Symmetry: C2
Subunit: 118 residues, 2 copies
């Protein structure tokens, strides 16, 4: 592929609304997307207050790093709190979801293999 | 599902002829990762990762401080809230010219090891 290095403020990317049957109150910035990624993509998710990614699973793994705020992680059995400075590894096919139970925005990085899109 | 405070992962000190004043935490390593690994680097004041290149890409997010990025020629300083995409084979390195620790997340395909 091409040469070089991209160096960019993540907030230069506009946060786009995600609205699906299972997601509400979430925006996403694609940082390193399909147009560039040899293997895996980097997105920055913003969960608005009360925002919800309902429990689901995917056939690929996810790697998450929490940048800002206090995030409720939905698990097959129950839920757990994480905050800025936590990482999360979601195995392929593992049930997971997220909710923001606070009154300020939560931000997290989420990376998936590029076969799962951006 | 693994949920952990990154700080609680024990950092590995690196001090070699090419890397000094750097600590590395393997957050998501080879034992867990099907495809790519997640590391968190801390660069002490004056710390250096000298110029090098790899056959794989790197995806970085700057978490704390002002990171000086070495390029094939010259350098560029960025700060917390920047992401960096290093193409495969691109010469790169890092330095911390500030008086406080700099931290960045770095992910590579698992062929790059942990
Ligand atoms: Cu998911
Ligand atoms: Cu490197």
């Amino acid at each position: 592929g091409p040469s070089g290095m991209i160096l960019k403020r993540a907030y230069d990317v506009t946060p786009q609304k995600i609205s699906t049957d299972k997601v509400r109150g979430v925006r996403k910035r694609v940082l390193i997307g399909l147009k560039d990624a040899p293997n895996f993509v980097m997105r920055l998710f913003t969960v608005e207050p009360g925002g919800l990614i309902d429990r689901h699973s995917a056939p690929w793994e996810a790697e998450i790093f929490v940048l800002k705020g206090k995030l409720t992680v939905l698990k097959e059995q129950g839920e757990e709190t994480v905050e800025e400075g936590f990482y999360i590894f979601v195995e392929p096919n593992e049930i997971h979801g997220f909710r923001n139970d606070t009154d300020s925005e939560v931000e997290f990085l989420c990376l998936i293999p590029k076969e799962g899109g951006e």
